[PDB]
Design an enzyme around this catalytic site. Sequence first.
Site, PDB file in Angstrom:
ATOM      1  N   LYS A  53       0.822  -1.209   0.000  1.00 36.64           N
ATOM      2  CA  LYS A  53       0.000   0.000   0.000  1.00 36.64           C
ATOM      3  C   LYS A  53       0.859   1.262   0.000  1.00 36.64           C
ATOM      4  O   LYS A  53       0.480   2.277  -0.597  1.00 36.64           O
ATOM      5  CB  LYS A  53      -0.950  -0.007   1.214  1.00 36.64           C
ATOM      6  CG  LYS A  53      -2.105  -1.011   1.118  1.00 36.64           C
ATOM      7  CD  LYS A  53      -2.911  -1.156   2.423  1.00 36.64           C
ATOM      8  CE  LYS A  53      -3.796  -2.402   2.352  1.00 36.64           C
ATOM      9  NZ  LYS A  53      -4.761  -2.491   3.463  1.00 36.64           N
ATOM     10  N   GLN A  97      -4.650  -0.955  10.057  1.00 40.65           N
ATOM     11  CA  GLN A  97      -4.655  -2.264   9.419  1.00 40.65           C
ATOM     12  C   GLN A  97      -5.169  -3.314  10.398  1.00 40.65           C
ATOM     13  O   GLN A  97      -4.734  -3.369  11.553  1.00 40.65           O
ATOM     14  CB  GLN A  97      -3.255  -2.632   8.934  1.00 40.65           C
ATOM     15  CG  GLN A  97      -3.190  -3.911   8.095  1.00 40.65           C
ATOM     16  CD  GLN A  97      -3.631  -3.699   6.652  1.00 40.65           C
ATOM     17  OE1 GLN A  97      -3.817  -2.578   6.204  1.00 40.65           O
ATOM     18  NE2 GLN A  97      -3.812  -4.784   5.928  1.00 40.65           N
ATOM     19  N   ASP A 120     -10.763   3.680   4.463  1.00 43.62           N
ATOM     20  CA  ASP A 120     -11.161   2.278   4.470  1.00 43.62           C
ATOM     21  C   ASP A 120     -12.660   2.097   4.265  1.00 43.62           C
ATOM     22  O   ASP A 120     -13.097   0.996   3.914  1.00 43.62           O
ATOM     23  CB  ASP A 120     -10.775   1.629   5.805  1.00 43.62           C
ATOM     24  CG  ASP A 120      -9.519   0.765   5.726  1.00 43.62           C
ATOM     25  OD1 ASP A 120      -9.145   0.300   4.627  1.00 43.62           O
ATOM     26  OD2 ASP A 120      -8.917   0.511   6.800  1.00 43.62           O
TER      27      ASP A 120
HETATM   28  C1  LIG Z   1      -6.020  -9.523   1.257  1.00 42.53           C
HETATM   29  C2  LIG Z   1      -5.156  -8.369   0.742  1.00 42.53           C
HETATM   30  C3  LIG Z   1      -4.022  -8.662  -0.223  1.00 42.53           C
HETATM   31  C4  LIG Z   1      -3.282  -7.669  -0.666  1.00 42.53           C
HETATM   32  C5  LIG Z   1      -2.166  -8.009  -1.630  1.00 42.53           C
HETATM   33  O1  LIG Z   1      -1.220  -7.300  -1.713  1.00 42.53           O
HETATM   34  N1  LIG Z   1      -2.378  -9.231  -2.399  1.00 42.53           N
HETATM   35  C6  LIG Z   1      -1.484  -9.803  -3.377  1.00 42.53           C
HETATM   36  C7  LIG Z   1      -0.571 -10.789  -2.665  1.00 42.53           C
HETATM   37  C8  LIG Z   1       0.784 -10.123  -2.443  1.00 42.53           C
HETATM   38  C9  LIG Z   1       1.551 -11.011  -1.467  1.00 42.53           C
HETATM   39  O2  LIG Z   1       1.493 -12.268  -1.605  1.00 42.53           O
HETATM   40  O3  LIG Z   1       2.226 -10.488  -0.534  1.00 42.53           O
HETATM   41  C10 LIG Z   1      -2.288 -10.581  -4.419  1.00 42.53           C
HETATM   42  O4  LIG Z   1      -3.345 -11.202  -4.119  1.00 42.53           O
HETATM   43  O5  LIG Z   1      -1.874 -10.596  -5.610  1.00 42.53           O
HETATM   44  C11 LIG Z   1      -3.534  -6.230  -0.229  1.00 42.53           C
HETATM   45  C12 LIG Z   1      -4.516  -5.980   0.605  1.00 42.53           C
HETATM   46  C13 LIG Z   1      -5.377  -7.127   1.123  1.00 42.53           C
HETATM   47  N2  LIG Z   1      -6.465  -6.879   2.036  1.00 42.53           N
HETATM   48  C14 LIG Z   1      -6.444  -5.821   3.016  1.00 42.53           C
HETATM   49  O6  LIG Z   1      -5.530  -5.076   3.124  1.00 42.53           O
HETATM   50  N3  LIG Z   1      -7.591  -5.696   3.876  1.00 42.53           N
HETATM   51  C15 LIG Z   1      -7.613  -4.621   4.841  1.00 42.53           C
HETATM   52  C16 LIG Z   1      -7.216  -4.821   6.110  1.00 42.53           C
HETATM   53  N4  LIG Z   1      -6.759  -6.127   6.533  1.00 42.53           N
HETATM   54  N5  LIG Z   1      -7.260  -3.780   7.009  1.00 42.53           N
HETATM   55  C17 LIG Z   1      -7.706  -2.508   6.593  1.00 42.53           C
HETATM   56  N6  LIG Z   1      -7.755  -1.417   7.535  1.00 42.53           N
HETATM   57  N7  LIG Z   1      -8.098  -2.286   5.333  1.00 42.53           N
HETATM   58  C18 LIG Z   1      -8.062  -3.325   4.421  1.00 42.53           C
HETATM   59  O7  LIG Z   1      -8.474  -3.098   3.100  1.00 42.53           O
END
Ligand SMILES: Cc1cc(C(=O)N[C@@H](CCC(=O)O)C(=O)O)ccc1NC(=O)Nc1c(N)nc(N)[nH]c1=O
Lengths: 290, 291
Positions: A53, A97, A120
């Site tokens: 992010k 987060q 968010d």
């Molecule tokens: C599930 C997820 C995956 C990825 C990502 O980068 N995915 C890649 C794999 C890269 C790797 O494998 O590292 C892919 O699927 O290609 C980014 C974001 C989220 N989800 C969240 O961030 N949710 C969330 C939260 N937990 N808390 C708050 N406050 N806000 C939110 O939105």
Amino acid sequence: EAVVISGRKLAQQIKQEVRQEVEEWVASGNKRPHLSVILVGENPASHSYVLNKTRAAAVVGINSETIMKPASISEEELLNLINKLNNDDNVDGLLVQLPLPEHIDERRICNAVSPDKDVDGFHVINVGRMCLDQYSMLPATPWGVWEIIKRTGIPTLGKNVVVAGRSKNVGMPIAMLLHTDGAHERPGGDATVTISHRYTPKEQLKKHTILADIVISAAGIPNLITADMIKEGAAVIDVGINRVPKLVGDVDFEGVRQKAGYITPVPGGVGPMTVAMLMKNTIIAAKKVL
Amino acid sequence: EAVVISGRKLAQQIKQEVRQEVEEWVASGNKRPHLSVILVGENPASHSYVLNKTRAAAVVGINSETIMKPASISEEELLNLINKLNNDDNVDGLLVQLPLPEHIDERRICNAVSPDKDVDGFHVINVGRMCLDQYSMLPATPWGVWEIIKRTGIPTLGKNVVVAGRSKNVGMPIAMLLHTDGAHERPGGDATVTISHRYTPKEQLKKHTILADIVISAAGIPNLITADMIKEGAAVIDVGINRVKPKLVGDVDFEGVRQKAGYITPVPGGVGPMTVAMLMKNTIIAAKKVL
Ligand SMILES: Cc1cc(C(=O)N[C@@H](CCC(=O)O)C(=O)O)ccc1NC(=O)Nc1c(N)nc(N)[nH]c1=O
Ligand SMILES: Cc1cc(C(=O)N[C@@H](CCC(=O)O)C(=O)O)ccc1NC(=O)Nc1c(N)nc(N)[nH]c1=O
């Protein structure tokens, strides 16, 4: 054979839109947008996703800082830090987060971010406005699923959709966005949405999915979606991200790859769209559009 | 044949429970509860329904008043009146009967009612809290649909449910309550819920209702739900009230569905009186300042 929708390429375009909107905004005299991310503890997936992010923020012209605090932090300390950032005129977007340690009330934390900085979409007023089809900060993963559908040109009006999962941050907002009215302040997909969850017998999931033009899986169960449940040519979108020393979605990718018309891979699917739509929300917040 | 659930009977039972709770609240040295209904314009269905609300108020020992205003009033004038009642310590519950004229923003009006007096559950905070399964003022008609189901013992966990209609005041809250977790602050029905609406093709609606153990129709379409769409023994709850010599019917083909359903509500005397009863429950809840 099924078109494998590239989540990485779509987020590339969206981020390109953002870095242009940000640069026009800065050029015309305004403050550069700033996003603060609060990160608690050492969940390896959390740190990894927060890093994605903040990399994305930097390449679109948005300043960012990650405040990391130990998992032993008290709820009152987090609420002090949140309140200081709420009053920092440099900070446009603020997100905490998830997940948070068991002893911290997650819902208390979410409502403590001021709704104008709540990129968010988790503050109760944002949830209520979203559920009333009003202009709101949309949560990033549900807005990413929506953008996957709309930019690929998959129709939704009058079509059958099944969401697997009802969590308040992913499954339920996806179901809300997809069944609601195209004509409202915040448009919806006008589809026919079925919501299933942990008490939906797998037999009854299959009887609803074979009817589904779009199956959206956000439950976190490996191999939940298999080829005998999807009809020919349907779009399948995989929000679940599961570790089985490998990473896989909720769908059985290879099998459904034959059966489906469209599909999204894991990784490289919805993941990078979550980061992309958070960038949109940050510049929306910097503009005080709402 | 199908068990016909009398919404009229259940509502009067519930009104009796509210009445006992009010008299005890008063006998304990509390102000008698007071409900204010604001009515704009002359929609006759609206006038009939507000009359039913103020009758139920009197029956359960709740003071009430209907304040009627012409449709030509301005949004600002409605807000002045609403702010007045928000500030009247005698007023426990406050509701503005919908729909309002096109020049009045419904959303701004519902958000103008103090959330503690918001017996409709229409304030954006109550909507937000309901959608997060927190404690909230539930809106009356969805709560009446829930009570019909729960007080009749019709099970919901793991069952398939179809809602026809997606309006924010009726169809959406019903589908939110039915599909959500039994274990949260405000429990849900743990059902598998399909939301259909005006762009659902009638043949696709049918392909969902046939799997359904409960069908709930809040569309406002005479003969929308017919006996061939319903599976055998299912529960069919008719939220609609359509004027069709002038007569009143539901969304459901009552006589036809009567033969294949296990349960069914009539129109009239079905969901309607349940709406009025749950509003009496919300008003004693608001008077007690429990949320
Ligand atoms: C599930 C997820 C995956 C990825 C990502 O980068 N995915 C890649 C794999 C890269 C790797 O494998 O590292 C892919 O699927 O290609 C980014 C974001 C989220 N989800 C969240 O961030 N949710 C969330 C939260 N937990 N808390 C708050 N406050 N806000 C939110 O939105
Ligand atoms: C639809 C309905 C019917 C009846 C009723 O009395 N039905 C009887 C006889 C019908 C007749 O007499 O014609 C029956 O079904 O048998 C009472 C109430 C409602 N609904 C509402 O009042 N909704 C509502 C709203 N419109 N605005 C606000 N603010 N709050 C609200 O809750």
